[PDB]
């Protein structure tokens, strides 16, 4: 298997960002580096080679992206002078098998300032009485808004246990301002239960939103709470009326 380090990284502009590609339980004399911008294709950037110079694809600046074959099991990609335009998904591969062994990728977020990082605001909306009357079913709606970067995981928890039945979630987050480069994101999900279960005041519904943010080591000067990796939830109790 090919393992990449780190899986995620939020970096300040102008820093040197190192991404590693390691072949586990096998040796690779060649490693490929791909880049994927959101809703776009994976594009080959460069080819790392043991005992020789790295090969670069057309339009890839050798000065901005340093490729190095550190050992027979390691290839590194260094984003020198990181810029917010460098924010992308970087995935490596090594030959072997029917396909190629792919790393799990690196979600690189480059921010001008760590204060551009925002956790989600999370709200829950109760089932409509009109839906209960028409279908004898009750849908809760969870909205997670104003988060940046666009990486969140939404789950539903009923009486303290995770549920999957009746759960339906947006394919991807929605760009709040599609025309703005500094747009924040939103994501919605639904949980449908029977109206009988919803109308029990003893039942507890909670929408949980995991957000990947700043590390413990990262600097924070704002009055608002440091937007570290965290869980943001919204909840509701069943309603007899």
């Amino acid at each position: 298997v090919v393992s990449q380090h780190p899986s995620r990284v939020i970096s300040k502009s102008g820093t040197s960002v190192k991404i590693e590609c390691r072949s586990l339980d096998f040796q690779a004399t060649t490693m490929f580096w791909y880049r994927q911008f959101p809703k776009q294709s994976l594009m080959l950037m460069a080819t790392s080679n043991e005992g020789s110079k790295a090969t670069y694809e057309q339009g890839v600046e050798k000065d901005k992206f340093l490729i190095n074959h550190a050992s027979l099991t390691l290839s590194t990609l260094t984003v020198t002078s990181a810029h917010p335009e460098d924010s992308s998904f970087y995935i490596c591969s090594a030959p072997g098998g029917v396909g190629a062994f792919f790393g799990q990728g690196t979600r690189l977020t480059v921010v001008e300032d760590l204060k551009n990082v925002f956790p989600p605001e999370v709200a829950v909306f109760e089932p409509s009485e009109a839906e209960i009357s028409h279908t004898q079913k009750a849908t809760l709606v969870c909205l997670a808004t104003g988060f940046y970067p666009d990486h969140v995981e939404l789950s539903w928890w009923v009486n303290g246990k995770e549920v999957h039945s009746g759960v339906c979630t947006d394919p991807q987050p929605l760009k709040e301002q599609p025309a703005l480069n500094d747009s924040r994101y939103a994501l919605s999900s639904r949980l449908r239960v029977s109206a009988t279960f919803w109308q029990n005041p003893r039942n507890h519904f909670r929408c949980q939103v995991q957000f990947y943010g700043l590390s413990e080591n990262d600097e924070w000067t704002q009055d608002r709470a440091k937007p570290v990796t965290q869980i943001v939830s919204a909840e509701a109790w069943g309603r007899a009326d």
Binding site: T30, F32, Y34, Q36, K39, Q40, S41, L42, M43, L44, T47, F89, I91, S93, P95, G97, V98, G99, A100, F102, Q104, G105, R107, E121, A123, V124, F125, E126, P127, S128, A130, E131, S133, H134, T135, K137, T139, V141, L143, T145, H164, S165, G166, V167, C168, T169, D170, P171, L174, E176, Q177, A186, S188, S189, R190, R192, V193, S194, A234
Partner: protein, 200 residues
């Protein structure tokens, strides 16, 4: 090299089959076509490989209809499951180096025997200034259009949790903090069934 996946998104119900098209351009005599699926984690999962000098590929529930002269290499997924909802990529591989298409987002939908399309006005949250509209119980082929107003947000149709085993339904939501926002007109940019229910 060029790989073209002209369909951005496709919807198909469970237990049916779906074909995802791919067209490529290459000057090479020997090559491979690969199909991958990208999971929400952004992890790349191998599905099947088609050799330029081979007969139609088959692996598990995947098959390729290889039309070499047409440089067409459509993937067919048989007996669709909720876990098949993902973004599918067609790639052309020459000496290990891959050229990828734009990918096609496949949404696998539940079998809705009795669609009951309706737009519900939800109670306002005492913790949010957002008013929410739920468009639900529509059929798989309903297309939910994007908002044409910056202050109105409209989602695409949702993807069911792959482990769901109850209250399976298609839905989209629209929300806004505008004073004039009403559910009666929120989804007007979409082509919806004439019998969509709009409760007062």
């Amino acid at each position: 090299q060029k790989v073209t996946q002209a369909q951005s998104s496709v919807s198909m119900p469970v237990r049916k089959a779906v074909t995802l098209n791919c067209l490529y351009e290459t000057s090479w005599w020997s090559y491979y076509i690969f199909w991958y699926k990208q999971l929400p984690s952004k992890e790349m999962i191998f599905l099947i490989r088609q050799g330029s000098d081979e007969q139609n590929a088959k692996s598990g529930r995947y098959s390729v209809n290889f039309k070499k002269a047409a440089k067409s290499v459509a993937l067919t997924i048989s007996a669709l499951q909720l876990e098949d909802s993902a973004k599918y990529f067609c790639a052309l591989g020459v000496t290990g180096k891959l050229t990828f298409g734009q990918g096609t987002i496949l949404t696998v939908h539940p079998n809705i025997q009795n669609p009951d399309p309706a737009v519900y006005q939800l109670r306002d949250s005492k913790s949010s200034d957002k008013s929410v509209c739920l468009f639900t119980d529509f059929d798989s082929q309903t297309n939910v259009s994007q908002s044409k107003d910056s202050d109105v947000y409209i989602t695409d149709k949702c993807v069911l949790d792959m482990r769901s085993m109850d209250f399976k339904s298609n839905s989209a939501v629209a929300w806004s903090n505008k004073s004039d926002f009403a559910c009666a007109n929120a989804f007007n940019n979409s082509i919806i069934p004439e019998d969509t229910f709009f409760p007062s």
